Every structure is written in structure tokens, then in C-alpha cells.
Design an enzyme around this catalytic site. Structure first.
Site, PDB file in Angstrom:
ATOM      1  N   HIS A  16       0.874  -1.182   0.000  1.00 55.17           N
ATOM      2  CA  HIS A  16       0.000   0.000   0.000  1.00 55.17           C
ATOM      3  C   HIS A  16       0.914   1.236   0.000  1.00 55.17           C
ATOM      4  CE1 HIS A  16      -2.461   2.940   2.289  1.00 55.17           C
ATOM      5  NE2 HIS A  16      -3.533   2.115   2.110  1.00 55.17           N
ATOM      6  N   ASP A  25       3.815  -4.072   7.784  1.00 55.19           N
ATOM      7  CA  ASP A  25       2.553  -3.260   7.790  1.00 55.19           C
ATOM      8  C   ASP A  25       1.436  -4.278   8.072  1.00 55.19           C
ATOM      9  OD1 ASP A  25       0.143  -2.175   6.993  1.00 55.19           O
ATOM     10  OD2 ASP A  25       0.752  -1.675   4.913  1.00 55.19           O
ATOM     11  N   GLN A  84      -3.919  -4.846   7.643  1.00 53.66           N
ATOM     12  CA  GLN A  84      -4.982  -5.771   7.206  1.00 53.66           C
ATOM     13  C   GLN A  84      -4.832  -7.175   7.835  1.00 53.66           C
ATOM     14  OE1 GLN A  84      -8.294  -7.252   5.279  1.00 53.66           O
ATOM     15  NE2 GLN A  84      -7.571  -5.122   5.134  1.00 53.66           N
ATOM     16  N   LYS A 102      -9.704  -0.466  11.532  1.00 53.15           N
ATOM     17  CA  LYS A 102      -9.990  -1.699  10.766  1.00 53.15           C
ATOM     18  C   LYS A 102     -10.348  -2.888  11.664  1.00 53.15           C
ATOM     19  CE  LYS A 102      -7.673  -2.745   6.938  1.00 53.15           C
ATOM     20  NZ  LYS A 102      -7.355  -2.722   5.451  1.00 53.15           N
ATOM     21  N   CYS A 158      -5.221   2.469  -2.948  1.00 56.64           N
ATOM     22  CA  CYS A 158      -3.937   2.979  -2.469  1.00 56.64           C
ATOM     23  C   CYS A 158      -2.802   2.042  -2.843  1.00 56.64           C
ATOM     24  CB  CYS A 158      -3.844   3.212  -0.934  1.00 56.64           C
ATOM     25  SG  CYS A 158      -5.301   4.119  -0.294  1.00 56.64           S
TER      26      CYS A 158
HETATM   27  C1  9PV Z   1      -2.386  -3.053   3.941  1.00 58.53           C
HETATM   28  C2  9PV Z   1      -2.711  -1.655   4.398  1.00 58.53           C
HETATM   29  N1  9PV Z   1      -1.673  -0.901   4.761  1.00 58.53           N
HETATM   30  C3  9PV Z   1      -1.877   0.403   5.287  1.00 58.53           C
HETATM   31  C4  9PV Z   1      -3.085   0.994   5.263  1.00 58.53           C
HETATM   32  C5  9PV Z   1      -3.172   2.420   5.757  1.00 58.53           C
HETATM   33  O1  9PV Z   1      -3.945   2.270   7.002  1.00 58.53           O
HETATM   34  P1  9PV Z   1      -4.621   3.680   7.611  1.00 58.53           P
HETATM   35  O2  9PV Z   1      -5.361   4.331   6.457  1.00 58.53           O
HETATM   36  O3  9PV Z   1      -5.473   3.194   8.733  1.00 58.53           O
HETATM   37  O4  9PV Z   1      -3.444   4.573   8.052  1.00 58.53           O
HETATM   38  C6  9PV Z   1      -4.203   0.250   4.813  1.00 58.53           C
HETATM   39  C7  9PV Z   1      -5.488   0.867   4.715  1.00 58.53           C
HETATM   40  N2  9PV Z   1      -6.086   0.589   3.424  1.00 58.53           N
HETATM   41  C8  9PV Z   1      -7.267   1.191   2.841  1.00 58.53           C
HETATM   42  C9  9PV Z   1      -8.144   2.063   3.748  1.00 58.53           C
HETATM   43  S1  9PV Z   1      -7.876   1.348   5.371  1.00 58.53           S
HETATM   44  C10 9PV Z   1      -8.155   0.182   2.106  1.00 58.53           C
HETATM   45  O5  9PV Z   1      -7.674  -0.886   1.809  1.00 58.53           O
HETATM   46  O6  9PV Z   1      -9.292   0.542   1.806  1.00 58.53           O
HETATM   47  C11 9PV Z   1      -3.969  -1.072   4.367  1.00 58.53           C
HETATM   48  O7  9PV Z   1      -4.994  -1.815   3.986  1.00 58.53           O
END
Ligand code: 9PV
Ligand code: 9PV
Lengths: 413, 413
Positions: free
Chosen positions: B121, B198, B201, B224, B361
Site C-alpha cells: 500500500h 505493515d 490488514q 480496521k 492505495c
Molecule cells: C495493507 C494496508 N496498509 C496500510 C493501510 C493504511 O492504514 P490507515 O489508512 O489506517 O493509516 C491500509 C489501509 N487501506 C485502505 C483504507 S484502510 C483500504 O484498503 O481501503 C492497508 O490496507
């Protein structure tokens, strides 16, 4: 402005501590919240929580409209010209660190000065100490007058053509002094510097109009102004934010991401990396609606009345010193002769009264005051003169109590 | 594990959108909260909100014990050895930026490498792009296998004796791949590098044990995992945090402040500047109690069942592509042939179904997949196979609908 009807809105005030009605006089550490803000968070999580922006589904659209709706409420509340100038952060401290990382560390060279004051809170000291160390610049302090106010002549003397940033509290969390920010901004600008205003203790208690102050940046915290914890704002003039780089990087604040280079979104989202503080920011919007309905000028008038009342009653107590000027915001920091302020605060909490003891995150000011710690009672829109009476009666009793144990102890030995 | 009794705890699930029962399949964008977490925030603001630490009054002590109590709940939840290794932040993104600012920018020189992967991400890409640019280091990518998994042979090949940091997702928010983090950490450590994981998820959906993973840093988000927005954690091994400088400076994280120099508090408070995210962190503690009572292994088993069910039913649809491996976490990212995923998501929300469309993202991954955007349905502990049936029936209808409008349009012209 009816304080009975306002107090009825704050469920936390209605309880006893140690068998006495609670008297909460610690709103400069954090404020209490009205049902309108707590029920806004409940409605968000019960009904329309979803992640924001790129709205494709109905709840997502409702949460996005809530979050950006609260951004506009903040813009109007401080009279900024545009939502692009309103960035949500986790609090004043993070807002001031973002200016020190993204603006100061990009714009200071050897020979440049950052000018602050001896009454600053740590959040408006340490980021500049680090930024000048990173850049080889110089940190300078404006001195204070004997009552804990700043003279504009000392400002003019301290600020020079090598000054690039002046950073100053709007209201001191220890002295209660309201600093002459609009005239300090003119002096900064006349010298080619920007002014960074720490508004953590002014925003909850008096109207802020950033166009009239002409501040270049202004920082504030939700938790001091009836809003949720964990949220704050950084306002900065749009032309300065447009030229600053992000302080944090990730999703939501980009436009294009390649393997090695990325480009940023427009303001304000350039400065908001990752999923934002969605519930907290909507709750801060509710706090602003709540304060606006009462009227910030009404709230300042009630705190002027409580502060005048408190300073008079404290002058009735022997053996008590109050620090700072006569004209002041709604707080009184003090010490009892010969009682440590932590013991003052301990004994007051046994009578239900909550105040704070320590250095209040202002160690250089405590040194200026020639003390190692102080006690502070601070007021807000739900406090009353009867609570001040309870405080001054308890301080009288504390004085007698410590006198009596000392006399007894001395006779014993 | 009874999904009826679990769903009864989430008030938001019980409503209609566009005249149909809501089917929320967007928990990888954010999760919904149970009454136990929402009522923990309400109890905090109704009963014991106050600022934390230096506790002198009764409410302050209750809030401090709540906040540090939630720190211990997090420590135990990820099986860290000490609370000193648990730092509260505003979310995964800020946690990964703190490692990139305080660890990478202090520890990289020309010739050093940071190694990441094409499925990361943005929050686990952009801070490293900036850190290597600041330091003159090199960014490298581990390539993916054709099903969107990583081979440990490619890891061994990419990571070298010049690698100082490997940063990798535990679970991909797009492919659903669960990466072999414990074996990647051995390869990093064998090369003299640290590994930054990270875990945004993975943490909500499967047990995390940082001692078994042996990760050097691990980042996660409350929103999440059934917890409040605006809060996250950075875990780092204590010996690495002790040598890192703070990322932000202010009150609460100091021990001594002089005019020009300051010294820092011990861990974890060295990394928590200013008034912390008090309510949010206590609410994340409640979310952890709630998930632990259900059992993370039970929740992973239910998501294994829903993912196996979904991949089978998606293979029943003609003209649909699903990306990533067969063994996966609880999400499915896909496209319908010839329908833009934003239009898929629009039409599903007209049938009450919430999914997400876009690049999630992860723009370098979309480029790897040779698409410009995808649709994603993601599952959590309150979703059911009947909701998957509703999704696959709606995608069938969407396909027919767009087929029919096209056929009609072509006949018209
Ligand atoms: C694997 C992974 N890494 C980092 C993030 C960023 O988390 P945050 O937006 O809570 O700071 C996320 C958040 N992803 C977005 C929004 S949480 C999504 O998948 O819709 C993620 O899924
Ligand atoms: C003038 C002034 N400047 C900055 C801060 C830091 O605000 P925060 O802790 O919300 O980041 C504060 C907060 N002061 C503390 C706790 S809010 C107090 O006075 O008890 C402040 O009063």
C-alpha cells in the site's frame, strides 16, 4: 447565557468524588463534553461510519459529507478564507510540529532566527529547538515584563531582519496572559518573518478571526474546546501551505505514485495522509456548533467575570501567590507558602475539587517564575462562582491544616 | 461462533439503503463497531474524561489508568514483551512514517538499500521513497509470482548485505495474500537488515504474535479492527526504539526542557508528544477485549470459510476476473469484463451493497495487474454467506444490465 441550562448538558459534572460534589476546575488540562458532542459520535458509529472520499456507497458518502462538512465548520469558526487552509491533525502539538518540519526546516539557514518567548508551552518550544539544530539557525527568546506580559517594544527589539519565524502563544496556559498577536504579526511581517500562533488555550474561550489576526499559521486542539480527544487543526495561509512539502506520506494525500517518485494531492488533503480522524473531526464540528450557539463572546464574558472574581477572592487569602497579570483569561496559577502544590492538589481532590499541579509543560517559565512547580485552577463555560468559593474555602482550610500539622509536629519533637 | 449473536452487537448493520437491507462488504476500508466499543467511548466522556499522567485528582487517575490499561491490552494482544514497545499513534500510516523518519533517515547512507514489494500500500511505499531520497540510499522491489504471492527465493535474491530495511505487508489489502513474514524476517536478519511489517490488514483478522514473527517493527490501525477512528499502534523492539529519536516533540515526551536543549522521557512516552488519543485508545482496548472474547482464530476460520465460498461463487460468474491467490484472507478484488468498477460499485449500492472501487492505495500493484482500477468486496466477523450470495447475484444482474443497455444502444445507432 444560563449556566444551569449549560451544566445540564454535561453528564460528567453530575457526580461525587470522595463523597463531595465534583468541582472540576481543570479545563485548561482538558474540557468536558456536552451531550450534543457525545451523541454526535454515537450517531456516527451507530449509523453512518465508513471510510471517506472516493464515495461509491451510501454510508461512505454520508461519512465523507460529515468529515468535509466539519472542515467547513472549522473554516467558518476561525474565519479562514478557504477549506484548503484547514488541515485536520491529532492536536495542537502535532500541528506545530508540522510547521517546524515542513516550513522551518525548509526555510532556515545559518544566520536565520526563530524567535519565541519565555512563557511558551513545550509544544511551541521543542519543535523549534530541533528545527534550528537541524538547520544551523539560531533560537532567540522575547523577554517578559514583571507581570508576565510581553511588551511590543521587546518584540521589536528581539525580532530582526534575520528573523524568519516568530512563534508565540495566543493565551498562556499558566499566566492567563492574552498576548498582542495582531500587533506581533505586523512586527514579524515588517521584518520579513512569518508568525506561528499556538492557539490551544485561546480557541476554546474567545472568538478567533485569523484574517483580523493576520497570523500565518494557527494551531488548536479539539479536546480543550468541548470536542473529542485525538483531533486538532492546523490553519496556514494557503500560499504558504502550497509551497510546503507534506510532513507524512501515504495513501489519500497522493495524486500519482510510481515506483520511485510520487506527486501530491491539492490542499488540504496533501497534509492528511491515511484514513483520517473521521469520527473525531465530525465531533469537533458538533462542538463548534454547540459553542457558536452559546456565543464565544458570551463565553469570554462569563470567564472574565469568573477570573475577576477569582483574583479578588485569592487576594483575600494570606500566604498565597498568584502568577501573571490582572487582565487575563479564565485561569489562576498559584502556590500556597510552604505547601507543595502537589499536596494542595491531593487535598483539594479529597474535597471533590480537581485542579492540576506541576510545571504545566512550561519548564522555562517556571524557572523564570523562580518556582519548581505551581497549582492551577482553570475555568470554562460550565463553571460558577460558587465553585470558586469552594476552591478558596478549601485553600484556606489546606493552609490551616498544614499549619496545624506543622505546629503539632514541632511541639512533638 | 454464532454470527446472529455477533451481528446483534453492531447497531449500524440493521438499516436499509435505497430500500434494501444493507450488505456492508467494505471492512477492508473500515470496520463497523460493536456496542461494547461505542459504549466504552460514551462511558469515558460521560464519566471519567480528564487529561492523563501526573494524576492528582480522581477523574485524572481513572483516565490515566484507562489509557495505560489499554496499552497493556495491546501489548498482550500482539504478544509484545513490554509496554515500552507499544506506542499509540493516529494509525498505521503515521506508525510507518515514524519508522521512516526516526529509524530510516538516521540509519541510511549512500549504497544502503530499502527493499519493499510491488503489492505494498502507499503508506508502506511513499515514506521509504522519501527516506531514500533524503539519504541518497536506494529503493528496491521484490517481484511477485504470477498469482500475486512472494517467493522466498526472490526475497533472498533481492535482499543483500547492503540492505538495511525490508518493509512488507503482512496481508495485502488488494490480493488477500498472506505474506511469509516470519521467514522474510529471518532473511532480513541474516543480511543485517531490520524488517518493518505493515499489519493494517492482518491484525483485525488473525492472531498476531510479534515474538513468533520476530518482526522489528509492526504497524496497525484501530479503525480496521472494530475500534475507534484516529488511533493506531507502532510496535518496535525495545532496543531499536531506545536508540531512535522522537518523530514529534512537545509536552509529555520530555524529562527536562532548557532554553536550547531538552532530554526525552523513557519509552514508550518518548514517542507520544502532547495530550494523547485518550478516548480512542481506551476504545481500541475495548475492541481488543471484544475480539479476544470471540477468538481471533475463530474469526480467521469464519473468514477462511467466507473467502473459499466467495472464490467458488465468483468462478460461477462469466466475464469476471479475481486477482491474487487461492489461499487468502477475507477479501476479493475483481473486475467485470467491460464494466468500469466504479459503475459496478454504484449499481451494487443501489441494491444496498457496499463495496469499494479504485486503486485501493496501491497504484504500482494496479500497474502490475495491468488495470487502472478494481472493485473489492471484503469481509469480517459480522458477514455471512447469504451476503456473498447477494453480491454474486447482483454482479450477475449488473453484467446482464450493462449487456442489455449496450445491445439496445448498438441497435439504436
Ligand atoms: C495493507 C494496508 N496498509 C496500510 C493501510 C493504511 O492504514 P490507515 O489508512 O489506517 O493509516 C491500509 C489501509 N487501506 C485502505 C483504507 S484502510 C483500504 O484498503 O481501503 C492497508 O490496507
Ligand atoms: C498553550 C498550550 N499550547 C499547547 C498545548 C499542547 O496542546 P495538546 O496537548 O492538545 O497537543 C497546550 C496544552 N496544555 C496542557 C494540557 S492541554 C495544560 O495546560 O494542561 C497548551 O495549553
Amino acid at each position: 447565557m444560563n449556566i444551569t441550562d449549560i451544566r445540564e448538558q454535561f453528564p460528567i459534572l453530575h457526580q461525587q468524588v470522595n463523597g463531595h460534589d465534583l468541582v472540576y476546575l481543570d479545563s485548561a488540562a482538558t474540557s468536558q463534553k456536552p451531550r450534543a458532542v457525545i451523541e454526535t459520535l454515537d450517531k456516527y458509529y451507530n449509523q453512518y461510519n465508513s471510510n471517506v472520499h472516493r464515495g461509491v456507497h451510501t454510508l461512505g458518502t454520508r461519512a465523507t459529507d460529515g468529515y468535509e462538512g466539519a472542515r467547513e465548520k472549522v473554516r467558518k469558526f476561525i474565519n479562514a478564507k478557504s477549506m484548503a487552509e484547514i488541515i485536520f491533525t491529532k492536536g495542537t502539538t502535532t500541528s506545530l510540529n508540522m510547521v517546524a518540519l515542513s516550513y522551518a526546516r525548509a526555510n532556515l539557514k545559518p544566520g536565520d532566527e526563530v524567535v519565541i518567548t519565555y512563557m511558551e508551552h513545550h509544544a511551541n518550544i521543542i519543535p523549534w529547538q530541533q528545527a534550528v539544530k537541524a538547520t544551523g539557525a539560531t533560537l532567540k527568546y522575547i523577554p517578559l515584563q514583571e507581570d508576565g506580559t510581553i511588551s511590543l517594544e521587546d518584540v521589536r527589539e528581539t525580532v530582526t531582519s534575520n528573523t524568519k519565524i516568530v512563534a508565540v502563544s495566543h493565551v498562556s496556559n499558566v499566566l492567563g496572559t492574552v498576548n498582542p498577536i495582531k500587533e506581533m504579526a505586523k512586527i514579524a511581517h515588517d521584518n520579513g518573518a512569518v508568525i506561528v500562533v499556538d492557539g490551544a488555550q485561546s480557541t476554546p474561550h474567545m472568538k478567533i478571526d485569523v484574517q483580523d489576526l493576520d497570523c500565518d499559521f494557527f494551531a488548536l486542539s479539539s479536546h480543550k474546546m468541548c470536542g473529542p480527544t485525538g483531533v486538532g487543526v492546523l490553519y496556514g495561509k494557503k500560499a504558504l501551505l502550497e509551497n510546503m512539502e507534506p510532513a507524512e506520506f501515504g495513501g489519500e494525500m497522493i495524486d500519482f505514485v510510481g515506483l520511485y517518485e510520487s506527486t501530491w494531492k491539492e490542499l488540504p488533503w496533501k497534509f492528511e495522509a491515511g484514513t483520517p480522524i473521521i469520527a473525531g473531526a465530525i465531533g469537533l464540528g458538533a462542538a463548534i456548533d454547540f459553542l457558536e450557539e452559546i456565543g464565544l463572546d458570551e463565553i469570554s464574558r462569563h470567564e472574565h467575570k469568573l477570573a475577576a472574581y477569582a483574583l479578588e477572592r485569592f487576594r483575600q487569602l494570606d500566604g498565597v501567590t498568584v502568577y501573571g497579570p490582572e487582565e487575563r483569561a479564565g485561569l489562576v496559577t498559584f502556590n500556597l507558602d510552604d505547601v507543595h502544590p502537589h499536596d494542595v492538589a491531593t487535598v483539594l481532590d479529597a474535597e471533590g475539587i480537581a485542579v492540576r499541579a506541576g510545571h504545566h509543560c512550561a519548564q522555562p517559565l517556571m524557572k523564570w517564575l523562580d518556582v519548581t512547580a505551581t497549582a492551577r485552577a482553570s475555568f470554562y463555560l460550565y463553571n460558577t462562582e460558587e465553585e470558586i468559593d469552594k476552591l478558596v474555602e478549601a485553600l484556606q482550610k489546606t493552609k490551616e491544616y498544614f499549619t496545624n500539622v506543622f505546629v503539632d509536629l514541632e511541639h512533638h519533637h
